[PDB]
Amino acid sequence: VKPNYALKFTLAGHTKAVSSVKFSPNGEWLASSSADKLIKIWGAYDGKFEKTISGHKLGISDVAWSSDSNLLVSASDDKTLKIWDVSSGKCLKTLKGHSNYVFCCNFNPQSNLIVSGSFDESVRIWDVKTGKCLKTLPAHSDPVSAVHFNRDGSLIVSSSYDGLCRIWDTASGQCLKTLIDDDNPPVSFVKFSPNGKYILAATLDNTLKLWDYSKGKCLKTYTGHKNEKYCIFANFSVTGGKWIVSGSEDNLVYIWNLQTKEIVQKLQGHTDVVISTACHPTENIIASAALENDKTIKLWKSDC
Amino acid sequence: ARTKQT
Numbered sequence: 001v002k003p004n005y006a007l008k009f010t011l012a013g014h015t016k017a018v019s020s021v022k023f024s025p026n027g028e029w030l031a032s033s034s035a036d037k038l039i040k041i042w043g044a045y046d047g048k049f050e051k052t053i054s055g056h057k058l059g060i061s062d063v064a065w066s067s068d069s070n071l072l073v074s075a076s077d078d079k080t081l082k083i084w085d086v087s088s089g090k091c092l093k094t095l096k097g098h099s100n101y102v103f104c105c106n107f108n109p110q111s112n113l114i115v116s117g118s119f120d121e122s123v124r125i126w127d128v129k130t131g132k133c134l135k136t137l138p139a140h141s142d143p144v145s146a147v148h149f150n151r152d153g154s155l156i157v158s159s160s161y162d163g164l165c166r167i168w169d170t171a172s173g174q175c176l177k178t179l180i181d182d183d184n185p186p187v188s189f190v191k192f193s194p195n196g197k198y199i200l201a202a203t204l205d206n207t208l209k210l211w212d213y214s215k216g217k218c219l220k221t222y223t224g225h226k227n228e229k230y231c232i233f234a235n236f237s238v239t240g241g242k243w244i245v246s247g248s249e250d251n252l253v254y255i256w257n258l259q260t261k262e263i264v265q266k267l268q269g270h271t272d273v274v275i276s277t278a279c280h281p282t283e284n285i286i287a288s289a290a291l292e293n294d295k296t297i298k299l300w301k302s303d304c
Numbered sequence: 305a306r307t308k309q310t
Binding site for chain 1: 305306307308310
């Protein structure tokens with residue numbers, strides 16, 4: 001019916017605003033990135049600080065895991081991405097080519113490829129083994145806010161402050177579809193649904209939308225939260241009830257019934273904008289993270 | 305970075 005997410009752990013350690021949290025595919029770890037130029041790794045179930053991963057010259061906006069949970073990629077204002085070995089903490093590769101801040105990144109399912117999005121308005125596809133850039137997509141006419149592969153990696157979805165969502169064929173780099181929502185507020189976040197059929201997109205008019213990709217139709221709208229300023233991550237929660245999860249500029253974590261669009265729970269505790277949320281792959285566990293006047297991560301757990 | 309409005 002409704003979840004009952006309760007605070008389990010508050011994770012302190014970052015010296016500046018947190019930018020992104022992501023659970024490892026094996027569910028064992030939480031990774032966090034931050035304006036403090038650091039990646040930190042935490043136990044997903046006990047909240048225990050594990051290690052700090054350092055090397056970027058400026059703040060980090062996004063981090064992402066490889067399928068086997070062995071690698072991380074981060075996106076930095078220093079114009080690079082870095083591929084990291086999680087167990088050692090060593091930088092395996094530095095991905096150079098973007099001409100402005102790198103803002104978002106993701107591995108494909110196979111994890112032989114990384115996709116990046118930058119303020120340079122481009123989307124780049126990188127070879128994980130070599131670190132060389134395979135393709136540069138002239139994707140948008142403003143900063144790229146998010147990039148995400150579908151469930152088999154055959155497609156890429158991107159979003160930009162230009163007001164557009166675009167779907168790209170990974171193999172060729174050609175554009176398959178542009179989603180033009182009549183009236184084009186900046187699109188601050190986008191990702192595929194777990195089944196690859198839909199796309200969840202956030203726009204900077206306090207609105208989340210679920211689109212049918214094949215048909216190009218908006219099926220669901222989620223409102224009631226605050227989002228006009230920051231690129232806040234949104235999630236599909238699939239482990240218990242089927243929810244949509246997002247942070248909010250009113251310091252709250254919002255949870256909606258995916259189907260009914262009704263707010264089912266609001267998570268109170270953070271003392272600044274909740275910029276990032278992640279949903280655990282197997283357990284009813286949420287991780288949330290907040291900006292400059294908070295700087296902490298919170299782990300929450302529900303019965304459904 | 306993402307942590308600052310732009």
